[PDB]
Amino acid sequence: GAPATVTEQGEDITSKKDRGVLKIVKRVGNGEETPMIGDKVYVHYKGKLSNGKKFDSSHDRNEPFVFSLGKGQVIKAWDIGVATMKKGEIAHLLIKPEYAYGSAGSLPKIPSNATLFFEIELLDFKGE
């Protein structure tokens, strides 16, 4: 499935090159600009435990998910991964627990040492 393909073909986008955040561009976006720390970002996404076992979607609320990049308002993997994306891009991320919820997890929703998968569409980003 999509997670296993990311394992297979995904680029390591971590500074430490620890495969903690793996990325595949599924649909190439447009323009050269990728967002800066502080930018307001708008995405659609689907997320799940690599298991399959909890599934979450912005499309379940039929409205974009909005956050400020690089303030830890989202897990580390999003701050890293969304920063790499161009407007219109769809990316798959596969994320080791160190870049998500860690040994602690976020119980009961997310267990200890969970790997996460996301499909993210970067809709827009604007200056703060």
The catalytically annotated residue of 39, 45, 65, 117 is 45
- 56 classed as catalytic: yes
109 binding ligand A1INM? (CB under 6 A): yes
Q: Which two tokens stand for residue 11?
A: 């680029």
The string of DSSP letters for 16-31 reads: S-SSSEEEEEEE--SS
Q: Is the dihedral of CA 7, 55, 98, 121 positive or negative?
A: positive
Candidate ranges 9-17, 22-30, 47-55, 79-87; the one touching ligand A1INM (CB under 6 A) = 47-55
Place of tokens 């999509």: 2
Q: Which region among 6-14, 79-87, 91-99, 109-117 touches ligand A1INM (by CB under 6 A)?
A: 109-117
Beta strands (DSSP E) in 5-115 are 11-12, 21-27, 40-49, 55-57, 65-68, 90-95
| 80 forms part of the interface with ligand A1INM (CB under 6 A) | no
59 interacts with ligand A1INM by CB under 6 A: no
Q: Would you say 56 or 98 has its CB closer to ligand A1INM?
A: 56
Enzyme catalytic residues: 45, 55-56, 75, 101, 118
